[PDB]
Amino acid sequence: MASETFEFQAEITQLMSLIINTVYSNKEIFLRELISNASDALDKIRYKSLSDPKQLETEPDLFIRITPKPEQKVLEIRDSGIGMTKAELINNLGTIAKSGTKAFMEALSAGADVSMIGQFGVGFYSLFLVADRVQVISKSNDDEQYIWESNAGGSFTVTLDEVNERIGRGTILRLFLKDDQLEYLEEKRIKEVIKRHSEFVAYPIQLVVTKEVE
Numbered sequence: 001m002a003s004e005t006f007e008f009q010a011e012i013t014q015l016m017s018l019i020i021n022t023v024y025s026n027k028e029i030f031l032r033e034l035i036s037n038a039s040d041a042l043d044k045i046r047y048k049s050l051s052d053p054k055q056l057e058t059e060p061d062l063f064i065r066i067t068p069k070p071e072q073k074v075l076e077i078r079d080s081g082i083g084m085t086k087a088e089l090i091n092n093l094g095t096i097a098k099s100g101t102k103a104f105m106e107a108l109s110a111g112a113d114v115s116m117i118g119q120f121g122v123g124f125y126s127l128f129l130v131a132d133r134v135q136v137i138s139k140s141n142d143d144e145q146y147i148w149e150s151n152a153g154g155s156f157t158v159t160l161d162e163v164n165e166r167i168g169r170g171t172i173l174r175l176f177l178k179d180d181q182l183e184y185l186e187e188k189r190i191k192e193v194i195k196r197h198s199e200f201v202a203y204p205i206q207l208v209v210t211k212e213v214e
């Protein structure tokens with residue numbers, strides 16, 4: 001499949017550099033942000049299903065699932081929420097600077113906790129705390145499955161997905177972790193972060209653990 005390439009709005013590039021280069025601790029907050037996002041997407045499909053219950057048939061179980069892939073230095077955060085169409089990915093993940101982008105950068109620079117990023121509506125970008133590359137793989141009931149991809153540089157690509165597992169419906173955040181952030185592949189560390197910062201989640205959070213049979 002041929003990829004389409006898009007330039008990030010300048011303010012989003014600025015934001016990504018600020019997060020990549022300027023913040024030094026409490027990097028674990030990325031997980032609470034991505035779980036909150038996943039929870040929002042699940043709320044949206046649950047709400048939609050109230051008056052359109054057939055919307056659930058593409059994936060009847062509502063869940064958040066976290067999968068460390070230590071060989072690839074990858075952490076995946078999956079939800080069976082509403083998902084995003086190709087146009088939604090292009091419009092919401094880089095071409096248009098959302099309300100809050102500039103406000104957050106100003107707040108961070110004046111000394112706000114990076115943990116406040118979610119209150120500005122740009123917490124997705126907190127993944128660049130631990131990752132230097134990301135794929136967002138998404139399946140809306142209203143479109144085909146698509147892959148958005150960024151390498152923390154100034155452009156991103158969107159490509160029709162003929163390479164990943166079918167998700168019935170929903171989204172996978174595939175984070176390619178930095179070498180100094182591989183603690184986030186460890187079962188105990190993930191459980192710790194979830195229990196400490198994501199205590200009030202309405203959906204089950206599943207952790208996929210790969211272990212050698214002795």
Ligand SMILES: CO[C@H]1C[C@H](C)Cc2cc(O)cc(c2)NC(=O)/C(C)=C/CC[C@H](C)[C@@H](OC(N)=O)/C(C)=C/[C@H](C)[C@H]1O
Nearest residue numbers: 037038040041044079082083088092121122123124125171
């Ligand atoms: C297309 O509109 C989306 C919301 C919109 C981008 C505004 C929004 C809503 C949030 O809960 C959090 C937001 C931003 N924070 C963000 O930083 C952004 C820009 C997220 C992109 C969307 C997720 C990849 C995406 O995460 C996911 N797991 O699907 C997400 C939260 C999608 C929403 C369901 C969808 O309604």
